[PDB]
């Protein structure tokens, strides 16, 4: 039963890596999205000039 | 031998015979005649980005 306490303080925690895991294509994707936009700003600027 | 050269650069089914498959009825037909080729706009160029 201690130990159970133990099992599911370590499910949750387990879960939030795995909560965190997803949002780690989730973060990086919005990295790798801000890049290519960035490219698509300002050149489109550029191409004002 | 020449002759057809831009026809067969464009593959002749006698040059008509495809139009009215690419849309029809059957899914068997439809399926084969799906491929869509270039239909929107065929790209100029010009200036931006």
Same mark, same amino acid.
């Given at each position: &039963?201690?130990?159970?306490?133990k099992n599911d303080l370590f499910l949750q925690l ?5 909560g965190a895991g997803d949002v780690e294509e989730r973060?990086? &994707?919005?990295?790798?999205? &801000? ?15 | 031998?020449?002759? %057809? ?29 799906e491929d869509h080729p270039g239909l929107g706009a065929?790209?100029? %160029? %010009? %200036?931006?980005?």
């Amino acid at each position: &039963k201690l130990l159970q306490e133990k099992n599911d303080l370590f499910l949750q925690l387990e879960s939030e890596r795995s909560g965190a895991g997803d949002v780690e294509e989730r973060l990086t &994707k919005a990295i790798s999205m &801000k890049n290519d936009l960035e490219g698509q700003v300002q050149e489109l600027q550029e191409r004002l000039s | 031998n020449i002759t %057809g050269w831009l026809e067969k650069n464009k593959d002749p089914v006698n040059d008509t015979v495809v139009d009215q498959f690419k849309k029809g009825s059957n899914k068997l037909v439809q399926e084969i005649f799906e491929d869509h080729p270039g239909l929107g706009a065929e790209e100029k %160029g %010009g %200036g931006g980005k």
